[model samples]
Target: EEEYGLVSYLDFAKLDMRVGKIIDVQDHPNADKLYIIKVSLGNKQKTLVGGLKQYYKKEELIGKYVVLINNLKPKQLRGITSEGMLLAADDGKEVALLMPDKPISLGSKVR
Candidate 1:
């Protein structure tokens, strides 16, 4: 029973993690609390819908570097298909997006 709840190291390795740049940010038409973010992964691009409208402004997120789960299954939100998930930190009182301290290549592997 306990083993079923644990993830194997090999399973964790299956996650395709990469760095991306927030190229665009827009409000979700159907959701006031959501934002449609366009991320550039060097060779390609992906769209992500995040519930960060209340916590961050659109202008603030654009051009920011963020970590992303590149291999996640697509999910639909507010009529938009989110291709990836942005990493963040939330501790009840405040929320913050996870970013690198210095600039690195886009689409870089996050090991």
Candidate 2:
């Protein structure tokens, strides 16, 4: 049988890319290059760990609204549980988090 790795339209539609507010930020004890953040995603809160410690400070991230892939499967990285994925701009030499240019509701859709 021929193998197909394509995602169905409905499957792709289930991805929840939403805006979330960073409520908390702290250094991850077990990981050297990770920061655990508490995010408020309207309906609920989640713990997201991102490896942006080298570029962003914890104080700068708190209370900042950021875009996140909310429907991502949970993964354990360096003993830290990451509930979602954060998107960023990668310009070969630097990675920067993409935020709203203006005020918007939490859990707002990117598209």
Candidate 3:
């Protein structure tokens, strides 16, 4: 997967990325490793299905900011519609969520 090849500007520019805040977190029914999280994008809200159940608790996620791929295609996960992706860094042994180092407003475009 580490091709280390160069990507064109168009490919990077085409993606709609933004800063989003988590509004709520719910257990994914029957899926212990998954959590259904809601995101507040300022203009609207979205649902994000993620595998952060073991890494973080529900209380730890609520009101947290995350890097969102706003334009990603939605996918149905275990009966829920995941509107977009929440970026994270992981190596299978552990997981780390991507968050801003400083304060960033919700729904702010992440170029």
Candidate 4:
């Protein structure tokens, strides 16, 4: 059982997030703004596809560090569960990826 109408502070503790580095933009078979990607979290790599073609180019994301929900379980798209989390700021028209101000180690956990 859980009381989750308004997220309690404990809800934050229930999250497992980490910093991940953009590694590559592989090709995807789609007409929508789909980008097949690979990201590294020091220990290993993950394949994630995101819809960002209309917003940002793959070149801009390469080598960029972004937040990721490390708790994501492998899912298909058809095994990249973290794809939805190119974690960024979006205010209607403009969208920007979230990044740390200081450069930390790869796979750094967010608490």
Q: Which is the leading candidate under lDDT? A: 1
Q: Candidate 4 residues 59-79, lDDT tens each?
A: 988998988876766566633
Worst 10 residues of 2 by lDDT: 6-15
Instruction: Give the per-residue Cα lDDT of candidate 3 at 34.
Output: 94
Model 2 lDDT per residue over 1-111, tens place: 459898778876788888889999999999878999899988889898999898899999988889999889999988889999888898768888988998688989876
Candidate closer to the true structure by lDDT (higher is better), 3 or 4: 3
lDDT of 1 by residue, 68-111 (tens): 99999999896999998999999888898888778999999987
- TM-score winner between 1 and 2, please give it: 1
lDDT of each: 0.92, 0.88, 0.90, 0.76
Whose TM-score is higher: candidate 3's or candidate 4's?
3
Q: Identify the leading candidate in terms of TM-score.
A: 3
Model 3: lDDT to the true structure: 0.90
Instruction: Flag the better candidate by TM-score, 1 or 3.
Output: 3
**Which one wins by lDDT: 2 or 3?**
3
The order of the candidates by TM-score, greatest first, is 3, 1, 2, 4
The global Cα lDDT (0 to 1) of model 4 is 0.76
Q: Ranking under lDDT, best-scoring first?
A: 1, 3, 2, 4
